[PDB]
């Protein structure tokens, strides 16, 4: 280590990490602690002033002491503690801390149901006519404040995805088969607590059709994530039900229709219709990853048995998402949504923000039944049922003095807006 020619002036022999010291009056000079200071070094001279841990804000995780009669207002619930730690750090000395997560019993839920409306989904529309109320009833078993929304999608409205015959532009399907014209994304219903409304509208929507098998749902997903007001998102847990019986188009497919300008990730609704499917490409998985994760969307993939392989795989690349097998006529959606919600709400995944060009980070997780985690697994805990507390040990290390200010980055469980501020202070001067 420091045993190899290292001596300089003040804030250098000091900023060479752990061992190295310089007493203020053989192998190497500025090298050790137990071999350097061993050979004539008084303990009043050395300059090794280090880093501290400052718990500036940590309201306790809400306990349920007051009982089953207290109905905790969503704003009072506290799942992550601390909330505003401050960390003084020196270049080489890990400054670890613990994070405590507890799963509260009840949180309001917005769920947006976004469905394939291509001809392949003919029978599925029929079954769904009563979904608005059955699902409300079921979802309330899990939440006091529930809202439901509905959105349909079919395809990009251009060569070669739909056929551009003037007659097929008006009926994409065959002779007797009535089909409404193709479209990209209809926002049928922004979020409401009125499930009858859901039912009233859903049975007014007509089935469409188009040409190529995969559909342009990624145009719709994006729009649902990025159009804040128009959809109705509140800062609560947000569920997007994406259900379909085909594969999906993504960036690079637009080229076939001369669409080569990448998706811009900005809202483009007018009359609750996406107006730019001609103009921007389908977004890449990575793009959706950014925007879902940026707008706290937890995604449920309700797809048919024959597209399970593709959607499991998609699930593996979308953090905080779930996939389930959807019946022929969508007969099992409701169970599915619940099955999906349970896994989502019983695992936690910790995501951090952007660090600086010489600052790393470690995660260690301590889950139920001694099941501990290291590395990338260090940010995961599953099998968390209501009331369970879990712990995370979080170390940060910097290499050398980067800025001379602070990087107030956040650590967050995917799905929740509950953050942990981690205000960093860098020590760059001698004493």
């Amino acid at each position, epitope marked *: 280590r420091c045993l190899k020619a290292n001596a300089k002036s003040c804030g250098e022999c000091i900023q060479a990490g752990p061992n190295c010291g310089w007493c203020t009056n053989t192998s190497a000079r500025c090298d050790d602690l137990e071999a350097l200071k061993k050979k004539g070094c008084p303990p009043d001279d050395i300059e090794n002033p280090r880093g501290s841990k400052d718990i500036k804000k940590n309201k306790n995780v809400t306990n*349920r002491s007051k009982g*089953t*009669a207290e109905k905790l207002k969503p704003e009072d619930i506290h799942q992550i503690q601390p909330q505003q730690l401050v960390l003084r750090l020196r270049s080489g000395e890990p400054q670890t801390f613990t994070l405590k997560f507890k799963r509260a*019993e009840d949180y309001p839920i917005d769920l947006y149901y976004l469905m394939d409306l291509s001809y392949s989904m003919k029978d599925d529309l029929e079954n769904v006519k009563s979904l608005g109320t059955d699902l409300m009833n079921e979802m309330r078993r899990i939440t006091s404040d529930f809202r439901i929304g509905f959105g349909s999608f079919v395809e990009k409205t251009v060569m070669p995805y739909i056929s551009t015959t003037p007659a097929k532009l008006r009926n994409p399907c065959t002779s007797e088969q009535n089909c409404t014209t193709p479209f990209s994304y209809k926002n049928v219903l922004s979020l409401t607590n009125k499930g009858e409304v859901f039912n009233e509208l859903v049975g007014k929507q007509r089935i469409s059709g188009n040409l190529d098998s995969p559909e342009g749902g990624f145009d719709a997903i994006m729009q649902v994530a990025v159009c804040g007001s128009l959809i109705g998102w509140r800062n609560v847990t947000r569920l997007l039900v994406f259900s379909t019986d085909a594969g999906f188009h993504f960036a690079g497919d637009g080229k076939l229709g001369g669409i080569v300008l990448p998706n811009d990730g900005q809202c483009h609704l007018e009359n609750n219709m996406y107006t730019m499917s001609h103009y921007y490409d389908y977004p890449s998985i990575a793009h959706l990853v950014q925007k879902l994760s940026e707008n706290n969307i937890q995604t449920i993939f309700a797809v048919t048995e024959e597209f399970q392989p593709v959607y499991k795989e998609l699930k593996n690349l979308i953090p905080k998402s779930a996939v389930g097998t959807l019946s022929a006529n969508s007969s099992n959606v409701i169970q599915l949504i619940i099955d999906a919600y349970n896994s989502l709400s019983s695992e936690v995944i910790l995501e951090n923000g952007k660090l600086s060009e010489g600052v790393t980070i470690s995660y260690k997780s301590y889950c139920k039944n001694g099941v501990n985690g290291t590395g990338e697994n260090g940010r995961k805990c599953s099998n968390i049922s209501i009331g369970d507390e879990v712990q995370f040990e979080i170390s940060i290390t910097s290499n050398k003095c980067p800025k001379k200010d602070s990087d107030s980055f956040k650590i967050r469980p995917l799905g929740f807006t509950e953050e942990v501020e981690v205000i960093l202070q860098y020590i760059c001067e001698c004493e």
Partner: antibody
Amino acid sequence: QVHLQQSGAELMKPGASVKISCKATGYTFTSYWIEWVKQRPGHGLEWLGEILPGSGYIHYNEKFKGKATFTTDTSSNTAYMQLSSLTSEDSAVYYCSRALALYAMDYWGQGTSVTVSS
Amino acid sequence: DIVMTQATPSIPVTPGESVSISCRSNKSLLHSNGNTYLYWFLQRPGQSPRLLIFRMSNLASGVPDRFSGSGSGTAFTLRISRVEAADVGIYFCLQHLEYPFTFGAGTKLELKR
């Protein structure tokens, strides 16, 4: 699979005391409150108290303060209720059920009758 | 504290007809939530109570659509659409808002003949 299995019928003498149990399977014991309800032949249903298997958080109906005492055993997923100074008033069927602030008493045990006769 | 009154102790009903069953309250069970914390239970004879309605209006799983729930802040009625032999029993309300929790005395539902 969600089931609450209560202890069999008990026969006691006026002034004794008794321990009724309720075992929970099919769900994670420490996330739901257990509820205790009393049913007298002619007095309908009566809420006694509740307890969260985690820590000793308890909430009592005052009428029963120092009549009913609640405990849980996490290692065996069993909740317990003790009746003491038994009289004819205490002679009833006793139910345990399940609750959260949001969803109360979905599931119930089969019942336990405590008859108190010399 | 909160008292629950189920004025009618029993109602005879011809198998097929529809019945309202009412429950009054000392205090209003409407929370700031917008949730009214009132529950409804049915007890078949020689059996433990089963849940029916879980926040003034909401149905428990397995409880058929024949059972509906509604009410003000203080006046709640449960309606049943097509009374069967299976729906014979005692119907209890309960207030899940304040300690101690309170049931009314039930209403016994039996068939007319």
